[PDB]
Design an enzyme around this catalytic site. Structure first.
Site, PDB file in Angstrom:
ATOM      1  N   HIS C  41     -30.463   1.427 -23.442  1.00 53.45           N
ATOM      2  CA  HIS C  41     -29.474   0.293 -23.259  1.00 53.45           C
ATOM      3  C   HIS C  41     -29.925  -1.045 -23.832  1.00 53.45           C
ATOM      4  CE1 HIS C  41     -31.826  -0.487 -19.435  1.00 53.45           C
ATOM      5  NE2 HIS C  41     -31.455  -1.720 -19.492  1.00 53.45           N
ATOM      6  N   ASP C  90     -30.918   7.211 -20.766  1.00 55.05           N
ATOM      7  CA  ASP C  90     -31.421   5.865 -21.078  1.00 55.05           C
ATOM      8  C   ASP C  90     -32.826   5.946 -21.562  1.00 55.05           C
ATOM      9  OD1 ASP C  90     -30.487   3.133 -20.912  1.00 55.05           O
ATOM     10  OD2 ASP C  90     -31.916   2.809 -19.299  1.00 55.05           O
ATOM     11  N   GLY C 190     -35.245  -7.417 -17.275  1.00 54.90           N
ATOM     12  CA  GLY C 190     -36.384  -7.907 -18.112  1.00 54.90           C
ATOM     13  C   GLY C 190     -37.493  -6.869 -18.055  1.00 54.90           C
ATOM     14  N   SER C 192     -36.568  -3.508 -17.708  1.00 58.67           N
ATOM     15  CA  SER C 192     -35.937  -2.322 -18.339  1.00 58.67           C
ATOM     16  C   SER C 192     -36.785  -1.810 -19.510  1.00 58.67           C
ATOM     17  CB  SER C 192     -34.580  -2.674 -18.927  1.00 58.67           C
ATOM     18  OG  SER C 192     -33.549  -2.635 -17.926  1.00 58.67           O
ATOM     19  N   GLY C 193     -36.933  -0.514 -19.691  1.00 60.76           N
ATOM     20  CA  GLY C 193     -37.740   0.012 -20.837  1.00 60.76           C
ATOM     21  C   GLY C 193     -39.198   0.224 -20.554  1.00 60.76           C
TER      22      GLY C 193
HETATM   23  N1  C1B Z   1     -33.130  -3.158  -9.896  1.00 63.20           N
HETATM   24  C1  C1B Z   1     -33.777  -2.546 -10.859  1.00 63.20           C
HETATM   25  N2  C1B Z   1     -34.717  -1.645 -10.626  1.00 63.20           N
HETATM   26  C2  C1B Z   1     -33.457  -2.869 -12.174  1.00 63.20           C
HETATM   27  C3  C1B Z   1     -34.368  -2.584 -13.234  1.00 63.20           C
HETATM   28  C4  C1B Z   1     -34.076  -2.892 -14.565  1.00 63.20           C
HETATM   29  C5  C1B Z   1     -32.873  -3.482 -14.796  1.00 63.20           C
HETATM   30  N3  C1B Z   1     -32.349  -3.867 -15.911  1.00 63.20           N
HETATM   31  C6  C1B Z   1     -31.193  -4.365 -15.602  1.00 63.20           C
HETATM   32  C7  C1B Z   1     -30.307  -4.905 -16.547  1.00 63.20           C
HETATM   33  C8  C1B Z   1     -29.077  -5.415 -16.153  1.00 63.20           C
HETATM   34  C9  C1B Z   1     -28.179  -5.952 -17.057  1.00 63.20           C
HETATM   35  C10 C1B Z   1     -26.816  -6.442 -16.551  1.00 63.20           C
HETATM   36  C11 C1B Z   1     -26.807  -8.007 -16.397  1.00 63.20           C
HETATM   37  C12 C1B Z   1     -27.644  -8.532 -15.174  1.00 63.20           C
HETATM   38  O1  C1B Z   1     -28.168  -9.620 -15.323  1.00 63.20           O
HETATM   39  O2  C1B Z   1     -27.757  -7.890 -14.134  1.00 63.20           O
HETATM   40  C13 C1B Z   1     -25.724  -5.802 -17.472  1.00 63.20           C
HETATM   41  O3  C1B Z   1     -25.605  -4.583 -17.389  1.00 63.20           O
HETATM   42  O4  C1B Z   1     -25.061  -6.506 -18.213  1.00 63.20           O
HETATM   43  C14 C1B Z   1     -28.506  -5.995 -18.412  1.00 63.20           C
HETATM   44  C15 C1B Z   1     -29.728  -5.501 -18.886  1.00 63.20           C
HETATM   45  C16 C1B Z   1     -30.022  -5.559 -20.256  1.00 63.20           C
HETATM   46  C17 C1B Z   1     -29.055  -5.255 -21.231  1.00 63.20           C
HETATM   47  C18 C1B Z   1     -29.360  -5.290 -22.596  1.00 63.20           C
HETATM   48  C19 C1B Z   1     -28.339  -4.965 -23.684  1.00 63.20           C
HETATM   49  N4  C1B Z   1     -27.463  -3.895 -23.155  1.00 63.20           N
HETATM   50  C20 C1B Z   1     -26.255  -4.194 -22.727  1.00 63.20           C
HETATM   51  N5  C1B Z   1     -25.433  -3.295 -22.241  1.00 63.20           N
HETATM   52  O5  C1B Z   1     -25.832  -5.332 -22.764  1.00 63.20           O
HETATM   53  C21 C1B Z   1     -30.631  -5.628 -22.985  1.00 63.20           C
HETATM   54  C22 C1B Z   1     -31.585  -5.930 -22.054  1.00 63.20           C
HETATM   55  C23 C1B Z   1     -31.289  -5.901 -20.721  1.00 63.20           C
HETATM   56  O6  C1B Z   1     -32.308  -6.258 -19.863  1.00 63.20           O
HETATM   57  C24 C1B Z   1     -30.613  -4.957 -17.925  1.00 63.20           C
HETATM   58  O7  C1B Z   1     -31.844  -4.451 -18.307  1.00 63.20           O
HETATM   59  N6  C1B Z   1     -30.897  -4.337 -14.311  1.00 63.20           N
HETATM   60  C25 C1B Z   1     -31.995  -3.767 -13.839  1.00 63.20           C
HETATM   61  C26 C1B Z   1     -32.231  -3.485 -12.513  1.00 63.20           C
END
Ligand code: C1B
Lengths: 94, 149, 254
Positions: C41, C90, C190, C192-193
């Site tokens: 993602h 993912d 932040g 994620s990955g």
């Molecule tokens: N609770 C946890 N264990 C987590 C762990 C990691 C994580 N990453 C996210 C991400 C959430 C988003 C939201 C926005 C938000 O602030 O909550 C969304 O879907 O738009 C976006 C994430 C993205 C999204 C993208 C590009 N992809 C996309 N669909 O827009 C790049 C990098 C990111 O961190 C994300 O990792 N949420 C979580 C929750």
């Protein structure tokens, strides 16, 4: 209950309120000291005792293996790294 | 496959067995036990029995609180998994041997350096008796008195 | 990482940091000198496919010391089953342009054998997740690398303990749950990955990829990780194929 010598493999019985308790020897377990610990050398059971990978085989003992960068040792279970930075090792804690 | 139910802990002087239902029709069971934050160790690999002796494990730390689960697999495909690719299971109640085992100088299934310990080597001053005799551990919530002689 | 600690410099040597035009994107894991695993993602909105870099040896994002190594990402391969915008499948395999040098601050994480993962690693209770993502649901990302020890759960228990909804995805067989439901500890955006690493008899293996969750540390919820065991084959395969002429590549999965 005990009169009926229920504890196998050398266990001792203790009568209870109808029941009994079997005190097994270190190598057996079970209500009647019947399971043999020594015969469950399979990979689903504490990774076969292998440090890294395990393969169970038909009619023969399971074989342990190592990840790329490591070599199996004499014991047949442990692995040692054959490289500098073997994966998953933390050099500052080595 | 059907999941096991009525998982019970039958325990006296620390000899601890878990029992459950049903009696399996073309499926086998495997049990796993852990402490709250411990890894899960598997036992009674692919049996048809509906009981599992978990004494060896719980007497390592009789004061921990253990949790156990039973997995069910069709026989033959003991690699059967469900929609979330994991095997069907059900959890037991928690069990804190030191506070829930039933009592009966007596030896317990608790072992120290290869030998067995005794009711007093395990309960020290938490063990009192009654007079016919009953053994009581007043520092308990459940199963506080034993039976009589 | 909400509730974590600072990962001592050099103790998360497989941690990667991805950036797009200098800006923090996601986390990632190093499996060998030119291959990194991250979360699909993170590339859903990358229209500057060359301005993507990966950094290793990184610890403190404010100072530069003698340890960081940076490489451009030559290719990003995602499962053909991943739908952009969703959380299933993912996973992303990134081919660097040039390899990194392994040093005491750059070591790869072992990609475990599937069987070993499903049967042995999966029942190891705690694993570590790390990153420089938010420190509270919509709080500040970190500067020093944070690491958190979370317990893993089998999906029946996750489903049994989670507060029914939000417009959640499901926990498929390509994911797993780890964390706490008392809102104290969890991974966050932040992060994620990045990795979910399990320690087994002295080595560490990659068992999961930080993927999604309901907020971060939301009560009645756990964090969801990609279950890597289901992709080993796929990865290994890609790592032994010819480079093919694309930056983003959608590889057949299975
Ligand atoms: N609770 C946890 N264990 C987590 C762990 C990691 C994580 N990453 C996210 C991400 C959430 C988003 C939201 C926005 C938000 O602030 O909550 C969304 O879907 O738009 C976006 C994430 C993205 C999204 C993208 C590009 N992809 C996309 N669909 O827009 C790049 C990098 C990111 O961190 C994300 O990792 N949420 C979580 C929750």
């Amino acid at each position: 209950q005990c009169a009926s010598s229920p504890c196998q493999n050398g266990g001792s019985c203790k009568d209870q309120l109808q029941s009994y308790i079997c005190f097994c020897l270190p190598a057996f377990e079970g209500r009647n000291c019947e399971t043999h610990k020594d015969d469950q050398l399979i990979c689903v059971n504490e990774n076969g005792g292998c440090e890294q990978y395990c393969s169970d085989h038909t009619g023969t003992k399971r074989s342990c293996r190592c990840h790329e960068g490591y070599s199996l040792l004499a014991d047949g279970v442990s692995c040692t790294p054959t490289v500098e930075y073997p994966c998953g090792k933390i050099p500052i804690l080595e | 496959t059907v999941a096991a139910y009525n998982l019970t802990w039958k325990s006296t002087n620390f000899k601890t067995i878990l029992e459950w239902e049903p009696k399996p029709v073309n499926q086998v069971y495997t049990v796993q036990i852990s402490t709250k934050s411990g890894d899960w160790k598997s036992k009674c690999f692919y049996t048809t029995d509906t009981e599992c002796d978990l004494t060896d494990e719980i007497v390592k730390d009789v004061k921990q609180t253990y949790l156990a689960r039973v997995f069910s697999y069709p026989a033959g495909n003991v690699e059967s998994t469900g929609s979330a690719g994991e095997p069907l299971y059900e959890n037991s109640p928690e069990f804190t041997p030191y506070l829930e085992t039933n009592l009966g100088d007596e030896r317990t299934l608790v072992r120290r350096n290869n030998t067995f310990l005794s009711l007093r080597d395990v309960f020290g001053k938490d063990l009192i008796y009654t007079l016919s005799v009953q053994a009581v551990i007043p520092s308990r919530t459940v199963n506080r008195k034993s039976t009589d002689s | 990482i909400v509730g974590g600690k600072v990962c001592p410099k050099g103790e998360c040597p497989w941690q990667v940091l991805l950036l797009v035009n200098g800006a923090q994107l996601c986390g990632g894991t190093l499996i060998n000198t030119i291959w990194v695993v991250s979360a699909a993602h993170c590339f859903d909105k990358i229209k500057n496919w060359r301005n993507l870099i990966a950094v290793l040896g990184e610890h403190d994002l404010s100072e530069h010391d003698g340890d960081e190594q940076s490489r451009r990402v030559a290719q990003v391969i995602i499962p053909s089953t991943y739908v952009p915008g969703t959380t299933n499948h993912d996973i992303a395999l990134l081919r660097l342009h040039q390899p990194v040098v392994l040093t005491d601050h750059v070591v790869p994480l072992c990609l475990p054998e599937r069987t070993f993962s499903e049967r042995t690693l999966a029942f190891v209770r705690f694993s570590l997740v790390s990153g420089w993502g938010q420190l509270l649901d919509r709080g500040a990302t970190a500067l020093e690398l944070m690491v958190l020890n979370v317990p893993r759960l089998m999906t029946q228990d996750c489903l049994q303990q989670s507060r029914k909804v939000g417009d959640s995805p499901n926990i498929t067989e390509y994911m797993f749950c780890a964390g706490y439901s008392d809102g104290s500890k969890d991974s966050c955006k932040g992060d994620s990955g990045g990795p979910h690493a399990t320690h087994y008899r002295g080595t560490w293996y990659l068992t999961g990829i930080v993927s999604w969750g309901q907020g971060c540390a939301t009560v009645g919820h756990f964090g969801v990780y990609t279950r890597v065991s289901q992709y080993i084959e796929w990865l290994q395969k890609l790592m032994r194929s010819e480079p093919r002429p694309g930056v983003l590549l959608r590889a057949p999965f299975p």
